[PDB]
From Swiss-Prot:
<keyword id="KW-0472">Membrane</keyword>
<dbReference type="GO" id="GO:0101021">
    <property type="term" value="F:estrogen 2-hydroxylase activity"/>
</dbReference>
<dbReference type="GO" id="GO:0008390">
    <property type="term" value="F:testosterone 16-alpha-hydroxylase activity"/>
</dbReference>
<dbReference type="GO" id="GO:0005737">
    <property type="term" value="C:cytoplasm"/>
</dbReference>
<keyword id="KW-0492">Microsome</keyword>
<dbReference type="InterPro" id="IPR036396">
    <property type="entry name" value="Cyt_P450_sf"/>
</dbReference>
<keyword id="KW-0443">Lipid metabolism</keyword>
<keyword id="KW-0479">Metal-binding</keyword>
<dbReference type="GO" id="GO:0062184">
    <property type="term" value="F:testosterone 16-beta-hydroxylase activity"/>
</dbReference>
<keyword id="KW-0349">Heme</keyword>
<dbReference type="InterPro" id="IPR008068">
    <property type="entry name" value="Cyt_P450_E_grp-I_CYP2B-like"/>
</dbReference>
<dbReference type="GO" id="GO:0019373">
    <property type="term" value="P:epoxygenase P450 pathway"/>
</dbReference>
<comment type="function">
    <text>Allele 2B6*9: Has low affinity for anandamide and can only produce 11,12 EpETrE-EAs.</text>
</comment>
<keyword id="KW-0256">Endoplasmic reticulum</keyword>
<dbReference type="GO" id="GO:0004497">
    <property type="term" value="F:monooxygenase activity"/>
</dbReference>
<dbReference type="GO" id="GO:0005506">
    <property type="term" value="F:iron ion binding"/>
</dbReference>
<dbReference type="GO" id="GO:0005789">
    <property type="term" value="C:endoplasmic reticulum membrane"/>
</dbReference>
Amino acid sequence: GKLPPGPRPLPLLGNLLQMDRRGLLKSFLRFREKYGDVFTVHLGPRPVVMLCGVEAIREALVDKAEAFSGRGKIAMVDPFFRGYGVIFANGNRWKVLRRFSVTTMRDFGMGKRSVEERIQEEAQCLIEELRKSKGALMDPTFLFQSITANIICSIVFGKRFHYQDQEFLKMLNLFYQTFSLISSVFGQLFELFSGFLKHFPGAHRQVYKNLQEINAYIGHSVEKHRETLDPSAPRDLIDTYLLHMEKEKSNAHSEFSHQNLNLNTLSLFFAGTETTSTTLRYGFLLMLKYPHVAERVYREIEQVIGPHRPPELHDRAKMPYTEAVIYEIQRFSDLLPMGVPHIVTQHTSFRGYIIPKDTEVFLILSTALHDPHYFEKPDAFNPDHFLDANGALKKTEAFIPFSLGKRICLGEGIARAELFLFFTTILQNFSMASPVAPEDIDLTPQECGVGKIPPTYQIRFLPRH
Ligand code: HEM
Ligand SMILES: OC[C@H]1O[C@H](O[C@H]2[C@H](O)[C@@H](O)[C@H](OCCCCCC3CCCCC3)O[C@@H]2CO)[C@H](O)[C@@H](O)[C@@H]1O
Ligand SMILES: OC[C@H]1O[C@H](O[C@H]2[C@H](O)[C@@H](O)[C@H](OCCCCCC3CCCCC3)O[C@@H]2CO)[C@H](O)[C@@H](O)[C@@H]1O
Ligand SMILES: C=C1CC[C@@]2(C(C)C)C[C@@H]12
């Protein structure tokens, strides 16, 4: 009958005075030193249980899924989402939204394109755009958000936007700034003291205002889908939801509400755009720092695919090196180092500790991805972390960047397809250069909070021959 151990808190400040200035993640890795894999930290007024290492995390999300499957809050965006949409929902609202989103993120209608096909098409558009740049320097952030946003758009809104569309780019800008502001030092501090800091000016207000501006776009798209809805031929995920709404309207407790429609839709957009693109940004920075890996990846593309046939998912199994590189990009880039917060949904016992219902829990995914027993020298980028003796692909159970269990990333199959196809399709057509010599490329993230965000950089894409 005790919570996990941890540093002794003060009233009001919780463990603030024991924290590391460099962030939550660093704070928690120090605590782990002292207390081991399961400990309690008081983030202002809330005790939060931290679980570290693949064994503890898997034991919680998979073996104790009846208790560890709740969703906790991200203080920076809770005032906006308020438990609407699939990411932030619990209970029956979650079950409904998850079932809906999973099915509709995969089955689209006979004669509608596959996931692979939309990605393949977006990849050709991206290569045509990169050709048109003629080797000019760019920060590729906007293009990497455009291609990942466009895959979600084709599912959600039934169309794609053009790369030079300044309105499309305005919404990409809002998603980008929001993810940065959520992961900033302020955003981390807000996680501790949201109750106090919310009365004052700060980034939380800018985040809230950004999300309302994206929400206004969605609300208008929804209305215009409603006006043109053909109940016999759903175009996209919005039409499918409208039909469920119509079908359940006689139940006042239907979860197909207007607020879930907007916020689930937003949720999918945010997650679909900022995750994969951020991974891509890091991956191309790593290719600049390790041009020998990129050159090896090209050799493999040449031998297995050739210089012109578009890459397809069937190529994956014949490309162990490219796959190792992409896993290692994900491992090293550690997109969500503390995952997304969980909450326990019933009184539970965990390695002797007793964790009461409603206790918030962070799974520190970063500790699995940097576990030195699975990855020798885990702080260095090295695709050999994923290769055996023969150069064959060695997967491992510590590779959990999508989490595990009931709340495991529902975009996983999409993200993996997007990483492989965009990565290989770009390298099939271009090598990369930049004004910064490999030795001087600094990989230090620009933010490290909920999200790990790479520094900005310039790069050129040089066409092959
Ligand atoms: C590199 C790409 C991605 C990574 C590393 C990633 C990682 C994650 C993680 C760690 C979670 C939290 C799981 C948990 O709560 O324990 C999550 C949830 C989620 N992700 Fe992904 N994600 C990626 C791409 C995507 C994409 C492309 C989509 C959209 C198609 C997406 C949609 C979602 C949704 C809707 C949830 C909430 C699931 C739920 O709470 O039921 N993610 N993701
Ligand atoms: O109808 C009234 C409203 O219209 C103007 O806002 C527009 C701007 O006129 C207009 O340029 C705009 O075009 C956006 C198209 C790009 C959509 C990109 C999507 C990417 C995926 C996630 C959703 C957004 O959409 C916004 C919402 O319609 C205004 O911003 C708001 O005043 C006002 O509330
Ligand atoms: O005592 C009653 C109150 O307590 C619950 O919430 C509190 C928590 O009790 C209480 O801890 C809180 O104060 C926290 C002080 C945090 C110190 C400020 C830090 C901010 C920047 C970094 C250094 C200092 O403010 C919140 C709002 O008052 C409630 O939010 C309010 O109902 C209620 O007014
Ligand atoms: C992919 C995700 C899951 C939760 C999240 C928030 C900022 C939308 C970090 C984005």
